[PDB]
Amino acid sequence: DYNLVWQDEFDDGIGPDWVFETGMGYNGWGNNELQYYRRENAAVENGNLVITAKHENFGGAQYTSARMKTQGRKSFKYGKIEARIALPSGQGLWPAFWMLGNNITSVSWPACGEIDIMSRINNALQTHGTIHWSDQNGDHASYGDDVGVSDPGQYHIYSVEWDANSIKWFVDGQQFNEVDISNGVNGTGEFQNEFFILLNMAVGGDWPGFDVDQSKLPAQMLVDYVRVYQK
Ligand SMILES: [Ca+2]
Numbered sequence: 001d002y003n004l005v006w007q008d009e010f011d012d013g014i015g016p017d018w019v020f021e022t023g024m025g026y027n028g029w030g031n032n033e034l035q036y037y038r039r040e041n042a043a044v045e046n047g048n049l050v051i052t053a054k055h056e057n058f059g060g061a062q063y064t065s066a067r068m069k070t071q072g073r074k075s076f077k078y079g080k081i082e083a084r085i086a087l088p089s090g091q092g093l094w095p096a097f098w099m100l101g102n103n104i105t106s107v108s109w110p111a112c113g114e115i116d117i118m119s120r121i122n123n124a125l126q127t128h129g130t131i132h133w134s135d136q137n138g139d140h141a142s143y144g145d146d147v148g149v150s151d152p153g154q155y156h157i158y159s160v161e162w163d164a165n166s167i168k169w170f171v172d173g174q175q176f177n178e179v180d181i182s183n184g185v186n187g188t189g190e191f192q193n194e195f196f197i198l199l200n201m202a203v204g205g206d207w208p209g210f211d212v213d214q215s216k217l218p219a220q221m222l223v224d225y226v227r228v229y230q231k
Pocket residue numbers: 009010011047048223224225
């Protein structure tokens with residue numbers, strides 16, 4: 001049986017387990033992204049975390065947004081990891097709810113492993129669920145799928161169920177992807193370690209492309225809560 005082990009409900013403020021990232025990382029957070037992250041772009045309104053992407057000139061970038069992680073504060077080995085999220089739509093927008101291995105600090109990416117619980121680009125009427133890792137040959141590996149979401153601007157539940165043998169993805173309880181990780185098959189051993197959680201909204205990058213509909217800015221990603229259950 002799944003029992004609640006951690007949550008952030010965003011009742012009146014951002015909880016104690018989040019660290020905010022700033023700037024453009026290395027080569028636009030490794031994806032040629034166009035936003036400069038700032039603390040100012042994350043706030044709480046009416047029981048939701050609000051991450052706002054803005055058309056705003058700052059530090060050589062023309063967009064600002066927020067990126068938050070639980071690294072060094074909260075991490076999990078296995079569980080049902082989920083969030084209740086409403087998404088804005090617009091060419092260039094790239095929201096995500098995801099996880100990275102704690103060992104990123106020693107083995108780097110993608111060897112640390114990455115679980116993308118939800119990602120979306122532009123105005124797509126679908127969302128994605130993906131893993132990234134370093135396979136048995138030491139090569140960058142990825143495995144993903146997508147599911148139709150009629151109105152991503154409404155709230156939906158995005159989750160993964162992760163155990164020693166598999167990762168399963170769901171939107172509103174509907175499974176749309178599964179990966180076998182049992183005994184570290186296909187060099188997936190890295191998914192047997194602790195992972196921390198991230199939330200962000202990028203603007204532009206390799207995946208969504210470099211055209212941005214600035215008439216959709218400021219754009220708000222609404223996160224009602226993040227919850228983690230374990231059995
Ligand atoms: Ca809430």
